[PDB]
């Protein structure tokens, strides 16, 4: 069948299998791409922690954290840490629109891990919790 971009229906007779594992079984890669910092945490199908990384942990300081290079470094570190845990295929669930949003995935790949799905989960309040006042520069 021609490729379907939609994720497999939960609790359904889906044929897709990555190393024999179902999509709901594939581990998850939560990426928080804050404006100045990027963090990556790999968790299991049962949300059991597997690895963690971030610009600060990789060592970039202050403004240097909020850069694509630092995000890729954090992705590589997280991928390396997860590989020892045995993670191969991962579902990326990225929230935030920081500069590291895509470089995190690129580093997570260069570290060896394969990505099967991208799931944006940036918190978008329908409306609530009024944000801080605008900056005048």
């Amino acid at each position: 069948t021609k490729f379907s971009i939609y994720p497999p229906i939960p609790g359904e007779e889906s044929s897709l299998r990555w190393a024999g594992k179902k999509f709901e079984e594939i581990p998850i890669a939560h990426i928080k791409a804050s404006h100045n910092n990027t963090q990556i945490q790999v968790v299991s199908a049962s949300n059991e922690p597997l690895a963690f990384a971030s610009c600060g942990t990789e060592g970039f300081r202050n403004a240097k954290k909020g850069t694509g290079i630092a995000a890729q470094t954090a992705g590589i570190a997280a991928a390396a840490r997860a590989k020892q845990k045995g993670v191969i295929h991962i579902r990326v669930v990225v929230k935030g629109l920081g500069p590291g949003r895509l470089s995190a995935m690129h580093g997570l790949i260069m570290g060896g891990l394969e990505v099967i799905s991208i799931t944006d989960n940036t918190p978008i309040p329908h409306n609530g919790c009024r944000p801080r006042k605008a900056r005048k520069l």
Partner: protein, 201 residues
């Protein structure tokens, strides 16, 4: 320039003219026909058809030149080449049969390989940002680094031929302050890696 824009630079290459007509493509045939109707700048007094013409060495001599003393620059270049060859011959004779296979003795090859080893890959430009370097800039940076290192005051009373020959051999063997300078440029580029995004091209 006293030459009108119509004048074209001369092509000094005997092979290009001795090439048979049959091997020529239609584009090449058209170019050759066109050149018969164009004006040609007088061949500069620097480059000739001698098989012993090395443009790299000629450019290095020009860079080493001071105040239009082309004769002295050429003398220094030939003295450096002779010193390099003599050192190579001495090492060759002093070395065993096995190492004689490894020991190079062609000063032109030594010079070219030394400059190639001294060519820097990535440069820094204000935007400071690491950036790619074009090939011409790479070659010029190599030559200028070599000449500046040879002109450094740290060497006392030592003549330019000896200094340059020693530095050239060190570079050919991937050692010396020139290679140290290239490594320093690479290290600074790595350190400013994070700023690579500032570049807009």
């Amino acid at each position: 320039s006293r030459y009108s824009p119509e004048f074209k630079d001369p092509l000094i290459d005997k092979e290009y003219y001795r090439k048979p007509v049959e091997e020529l493509t239609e584009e090449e045939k058209y170019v050759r026909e066109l050149k018969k109707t164009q004006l040609i700048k007088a061949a500069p007094a620097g480059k000739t058809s001698s098989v012993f013409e090395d443009p790299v060495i000629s450019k290095f001599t020009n860079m080493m030149m001071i105040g239009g003393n082309k004769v002295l620059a050429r003398s220094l270049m030939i003295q450096t080449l002779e010193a390099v060859k003599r050192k190579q011959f001495e090492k060759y004779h002093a070395a065993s049969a096995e190492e004689q296979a490894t020991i190079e003795r062609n000063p032109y090859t030594i010079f070219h390989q030394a400059l190639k080893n001294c060519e820097p890959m990535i440069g820094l430009v204000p935007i400071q940002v690491p950036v790619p370097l074009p090939d011409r800039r790479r070659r010029f940076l190599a030559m200028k680094w070599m000449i500046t290192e040879c002109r450094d005051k740290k060497h006392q009373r030592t003549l330019m031929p000896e200094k340059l020959s020693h530095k050239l051999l060190e570079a050919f063997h991937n050692q010396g302050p020139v290679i140290k300078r290239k490594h320093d440029l690479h290290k600074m580029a790595e350190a400013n890696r994070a700023l690579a995004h500032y570049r807009w091209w």
